[PDB]
Amino acid sequence: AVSESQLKKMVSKYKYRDLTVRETVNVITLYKDLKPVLDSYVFNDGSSRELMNLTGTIPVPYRGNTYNIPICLWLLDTYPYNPPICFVKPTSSMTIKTGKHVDANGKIYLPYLHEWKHPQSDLLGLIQVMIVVFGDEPPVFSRP
């Protein structure tokens, strides 16, 4: 979706650029509908930082169909030593399905994130558990 050189420039203010670029490429080379975006992230306390996120869709199997489920994964400037902050991003034609892994704001909660530790944990492994969990219980539904 963007070149390795442009990705490196996007994360110029990151503390661990080579590690963040490598883990990001490892996902966007396989998941072509995820794109790195530089945007202003608002922390829960109202402070903000310009961060790279992955925005787009991941393919999720459900009842023999495959959905392009919209997500946003924010990388903190300490990536990969702290987990990404992850959201389901419903379109105007979707609603969030809440449960133990998804709140009404679309924030994702997983053991993978709670137990995050570099280098056991990585961005590709997070996408893989997200696809397994959402295939069991899709986190968004379209209009009836």
């Binding site: 869709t57 009842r63 489920i69 419903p90 379109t91 609603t95 899709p138 379209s142 209009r143 009836p144």
Partner: peptide, 10 residues
């Protein structure tokens, strides 16, 4: 492609 999701039951 475009975002998609299973239709909510009515």
């Amino acid at each position: 492609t475009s975002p998609s999701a299973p239709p909510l039951p009515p």
